[PDB]
Amino acid sequence: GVVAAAEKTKQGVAEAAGKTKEGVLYVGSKTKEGVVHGVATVAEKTKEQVTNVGGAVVTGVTAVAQKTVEGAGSIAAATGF
Amino acid sequence: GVVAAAEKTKQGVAEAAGKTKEGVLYVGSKTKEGVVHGVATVAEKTKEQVTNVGGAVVTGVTAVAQKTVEGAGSIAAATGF
Amino acid sequence: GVVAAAEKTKQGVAEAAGKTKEGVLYVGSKTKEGVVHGVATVAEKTKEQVTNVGGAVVTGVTAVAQKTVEGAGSIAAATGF
Amino acid sequence: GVVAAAEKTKQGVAEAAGKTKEGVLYVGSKTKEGVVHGVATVAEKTKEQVTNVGGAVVTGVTAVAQKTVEGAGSIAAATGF
Amino acid sequence: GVVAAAEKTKQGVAEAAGKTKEGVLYVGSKTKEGVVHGVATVAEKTKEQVTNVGGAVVTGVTAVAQKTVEGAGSIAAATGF
Amino acid sequence: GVLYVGSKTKEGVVHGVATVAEKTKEQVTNVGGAVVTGVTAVAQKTVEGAGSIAAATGFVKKDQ
Amino acid sequence: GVLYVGSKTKEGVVHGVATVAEKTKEQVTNVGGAVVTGVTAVAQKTVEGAGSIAAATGFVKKDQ
Amino acid sequence: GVLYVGSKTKEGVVHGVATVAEKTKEQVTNVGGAVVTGVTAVAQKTVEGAGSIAAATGFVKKDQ
Amino acid sequence: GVLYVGSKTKEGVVHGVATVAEKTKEQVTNVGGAVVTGVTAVAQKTVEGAGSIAAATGFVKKDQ
Amino acid sequence: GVLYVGSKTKEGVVHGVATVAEKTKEQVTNVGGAVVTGVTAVAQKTVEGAGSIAAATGFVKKDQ
């Protein structure tokens, strides 16, 4: 039994709410998951060599956002039998 | 039994809500998952060599946003039998 | 039993809502999944060599947004028997 | 039993809603999945060599947005028997 | 039995709420999970060599945000039988 | 020898203005004045002139 | 020999203005004045002039 | 020989203004004055001039 | 020989202004004055001029 | 030979202003004065001029 009321006013507002469940607000928010940012470099001479044989190799600048549910999550997996 | 009321007003508003469940608001928000950003480089001489044999190789600038449900999630997978 | 009412007003509004479930609002929001951005480089001489034999090689600037449900998700997969 | 009412007004509005389920609003929102953006380069001399034999090679600037349901999703897959 | 009321006012507001459950607000907040940021370097001569055989190798600048539910989560996994 | 290769430039730009008004009541009673309550995006590059208003919103000018 | 390769530039830019008004009541009674209650994005590069208003919002000018 | 390679620049920029008003009541009664209660984003690069207002919000100018 | 490689620069920037007003009551009764109660983001680079207001908010100027 | 490689610079920047007003009552009765009660972010780089206000908020100027 909720009641509001205004009378003999020049500017009146009557708000009446019985039950309320507010919700989530993301205002101007930020989120970063698995991020690289601003990787500056100055190298007069650069050399990068990779010699992979039957394996997994992951080089360079990498960013990964990985959600696995029922499996083996990895970035570089190698397996033999 | 919710009730609002306004009377003898020059500007009146009567709002009456019985039950309310607010919802999610994303106002001006940002989200980054698996992102690279601003990778500057100055290299007078550069060399990149890769010699892969029966394997997985992942180089360079990479960004991955990977959602697996019922499998093995990876970036570089190698397998033998 | 929700009730609103306004009387003898010059500008009146009577809003009455019995039950309400608000919804999601994305106002001006952004989202990035698997993104690269602003990769500047200055290299007077550049060389890139790849010699793949029976394997998987993934180089250069790559962005991947990969959702797998019932399979092995990867960026570079190699398999033998 | 929801009721609204306005009387003896110069400008009146009577809104009455019994049940409401609001919906999703995307107003001015953005979304990026598997995107590259602004990849500037200055290289007085450039060379790119690839020598693939029975394998998978994926170079250069690539962007992939890949949704697989019941299969192995990849960017470069190699398989033998 | 909640009640509000205003009378004989020039500017009146009558708010009456029976029950309220406020919600989460993220206003201007930030979050970083698995992030690298500002990795500057000056190296007149650089060399990077990797010789992987049947194993997993993960080098360079990497950022990973990895949520696994029912699997072995890793960055570099190697297995044999 | 200038070179623009894929460059960008924004001079006097209004970009990406989003707005939502949901179930908002509103009652205005204006008498000889200005009442602004809506979206308004103005973008200019050059506005040159003495005694000149370059962008006005809800303005009331009564001089002598 | 200038070179712009993928460069960017923003001079006088209003970018990404988001706004939400949900279930807001509002009652204005203006008499000969200004009332601003809405979004307003102004972006200018050059505004040159003596005695000049470059951007006004809710302004009341009554001189003699 | 200047070189801009992927560079950025922001001169006079308003970026990312978020605002929410939820269930806010508000009652204004203005008489010959200014009342500002809304979002307002102004971005300028150059504003040159004697006796010039470069950005006004809720202004009341009554000179002689 | 200047070189900008991935550089950034912010001169006169307003970035990331968030605001929330939830269930706020408010009652203003202004008479010939200024009342500012909203968001206001101003960003300028150069504002040159004698006797010039570069950014005003809730201003009341009555000279002689 | 200057080199900027991934550098940053912020001159006159207002960044990340968050504000929340929850269930706040407020009642103003202004008569010929200034009342500021809202967010206000001002960012400038250069403001040069004799007798010049560079940023005013809730100002009342009555000279002779």
Swiss-Prot record, chains A, B, C, D, E:
Main localization (coarse): cytoplasm
Sequence repeat positions: 7-17, 18-28, 29-43, 44-54
An MF annotation (GO) of this entry: protein domain specific binding
Residues found modified as Phosphoserine: S74
Superkingdom of the organism of origin: Eukaryota
Post-translational modification, as annotated: Phosphorylated, predominantly on serine residues. Phosphorylation by CK1 appears to occur on residues distinct from the residue phosphorylated by other kinases. Hallmark lesions of neurodegenerative synucleinopathies contain alpha-synuclein that is modified by nitration of tyrosine residues and possibly by dityrosine cross-linking to generated stable oligomers.
Assembly: Soluble monomer. Homotetramer. A dynamic intracellular population of tetramers and monomers coexists normally and the tetramer plays an essential role in maintaining homeostasis. Interacts with UCHL1. Interacts with phospholipase D and histones. Interacts (via N-terminus) with synphilin-1/SNCAIP; this interaction promotes formation of SNCA inclusions in the cytoplasm. Interacts with CALM1. Interacts with STXBP1; this interaction controls SNCA self-replicating aggregation. Interacts with SNARE components VAMP2 and SNAP25; these interactions allows SNARE complex assembly and integrity.
Name of this protein: Alpha-synuclein
Organism: Homo sapiens (Human)
Residue numbers of the full-length protein present here: 14 to 94 of 140
From Swiss-Prot, chains F, G, H, I, J:
Extent of the Sequence repeats: 7-21, 22-32
Phenotypic consequence of Y4F: No effect on osmotic stress-induced phosphorylation
Modified residues (Phosphoserine): S52
Location(s) in or outside the cell: Cytoplasm; Membrane; Nucleus; Synapse
Positions with a binding annotation for Cu cation: H15
PTM text: Phosphorylated, predominantly on serine residues. Phosphorylation by CK1 appears to occur on residues distinct from the residue phosphorylated by other kinases. Hallmark lesions of neurodegenerative synucleinopathies contain alpha-synuclein that is modified by nitration of tyrosine residues and possibly by dityrosine cross-linking to generated stable oligomers.
Tissues/organs with expression: Highly expressed in presynaptic terminals in the central nervous system. Expressed principally in brain.
Region of interest (4 X 11 AA tandem repeats of [EGS]-K-T-K-[EQ]-[GQ]-V-X(4)), ranges: 1-32
Effect of E11K: In PARK1 and DLB; significant increase in binding to negatively charged phospholipid liposomes; increases oligomerization
Description of how the protein assembles with itself and partners: Soluble monomer. Homotetramer. A dynamic intracellular population of tetramers and monomers coexists normally and the tetramer plays an essential role in maintaining homeostasis. Interacts with UCHL1. Interacts with phospholipase D and histones. Interacts (via N-terminus) with synphilin-1/SNCAIP; this interaction promotes formation of SNCA inclusions in the cytoplasm. Interacts with CALM1. Interacts with STXBP1; this interaction controls SNCA self-replicating aggregation. Interacts with SNARE components VAMP2 and SNAP25; these interactions allows SNARE complex assembly and integrity.
Disease / disorder: Genetic alterations of SNCA resulting in aberrant polymerization into fibrils, are associated with several neurodegenerative diseases (synucleinopathies). SNCA fibrillar aggregates represent the major non A-beta component of Alzheimer disease amyloid plaque, and a major component of Lewy body inclusions. They are also found within Lewy body (LB)-like intraneuronal inclusions, glial inclusions and axonal spheroids in neurodegeneration with brain iron accumulation type 1.
Family listed: Belongs to the synuclein family.
Free-text note regarding domains: The 'non A-beta component of Alzheimer disease amyloid plaque' domain (NAC domain) is involved in fibrils formation. The middle hydrophobic region forms the core of the filaments. The C-terminus may regulate aggregation and determine the diameter of the filaments.
Function: Neuronal protein that plays several roles in synaptic activity such as regulation of synaptic vesicle trafficking and subsequent neurotransmitter release. Participates as a monomer in synaptic vesicle exocytosis by enhancing vesicle priming, fusion and dilation of exocytotic fusion pores. Mechanistically, acts by increasing local Ca(2+) release from microdomains which is essential for the enhancement of ATP-induced exocytosis.
Organism this protein belongs to: Homo sapiens
